[PDB]
Amino acid sequence: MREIVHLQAGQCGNQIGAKFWEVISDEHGIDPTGTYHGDSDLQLERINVYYNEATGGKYVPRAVLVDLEPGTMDSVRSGPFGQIFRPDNFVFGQSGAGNNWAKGHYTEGAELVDSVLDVVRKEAESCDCLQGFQLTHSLGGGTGSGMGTLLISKIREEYPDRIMNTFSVVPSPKVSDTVVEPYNATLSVHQLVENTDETYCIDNEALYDICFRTLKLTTPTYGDLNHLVSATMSGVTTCLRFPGQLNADLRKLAVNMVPFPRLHFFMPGFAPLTSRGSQQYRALTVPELTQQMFDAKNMMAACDPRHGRYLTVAAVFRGRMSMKEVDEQMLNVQNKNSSYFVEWIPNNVKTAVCDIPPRGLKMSATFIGNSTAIQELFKRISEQFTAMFRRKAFLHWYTGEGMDEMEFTEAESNMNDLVSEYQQYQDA
Amino acid sequence: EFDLSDPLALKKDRPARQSDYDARNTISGMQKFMGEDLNFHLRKKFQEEQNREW
């Protein structure tokens, strides 16, 4: 009755979503075969927001699996939670995108968008009252950025009133693994700007810095990065699923996060996050929870928020806690530190609490921050793109597929306009 | 009183990891991770030995 249709495209999108459904199935108590086998009624009361119902007491997720290469399709179901998804929802192409935004948007994604949308209309129109959509992908690959932006356009023209979310892994600043990811990132901002209500920018080296400095892993892999991303997705929609003292659902935080309909790029963050050697030295309380919550080390976006000003901040809490101390010290972080908050909004920070913590913690919270300093994430891709367009570096892989130089010129112009958006609202 | 459990020195409680291999942290909790190789040494000395007769 407040359900959301999950969308996921690309190898990064499928692997992040696969780990996301593992976290959700643990917290709701859903075994890999898909039967509720938990310990409380308050895990099944709102099971319909993510899981459907199948005969025999079986709970099928509402996610639809999208890729252009069928190699990741076998990897998703062969994972430890891969039998949970419906085989009809596994919709996919036969030829890979090859890190090309043109193939994902024009050539290969055109025949596949009509097939996935039928599965999307399948799982969205069986809802009595749909709350919105949630798509996770990456902005470095071909089907993650190409078809991940085409799917955004088709849903918004079909469901304009419903909210749309995007968990986009925007490409890493210093370390890289694709030579054309500046091309794919530049062409995928303009579609994100005009047709998305929440966009959470996630960086790989920001996750790596978290895995190194905070967690002290010996050898982090992609499973650990999807583990940390899945903390946000479960943490953001905690009020849709579990009761709270003062709850705030998916759309209500959106209202007091974006002052204007284009500045919708946030930095995620998970507060209660501790290395093995420092577990016994740390006491799980709220004042230490909110001090790691606002730390730049804990941020899952590799842009320092002290370089800009926080336009709007929010942090939804989970666990049995007292409202007074949450309210007074989230005031304090505005008061002891008033330089990185915008002066033209008096209270920049939204609070919300859920009674039920994640399974595995006494108490938890996550972070959503709309800061100005995410413009330094974008204009550095711009200088990394304007080094390639002037010499036409890898342009023939794109113009030979049904594009032109005008689309790159405009996509640079809308991206430079958004970097101009945050700079004026910082200076104001 | 009704709520309690915030005041009067109830901070003396569980560190959320008493030790390794506990059955309570699971995967929804963000304390256990796949990337930490507790057998990183034991896998290494297996591989140090494995390259020798190779």
């Binding site: 076998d74 990897s75 179901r77 062969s78 994972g79 430890p80 596994f90 036969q94 499973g223 | 796949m34």
Partner: peptide, 27 residues
Amino acid sequence: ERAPQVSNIRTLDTPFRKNCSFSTPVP
């Protein structure tokens, strides 16, 4: 060591072989 947790594990000697039992459309 973390191979079960990659495609479907049937090849015993090398568990990092491809297994398109899926894809491969029914036509």
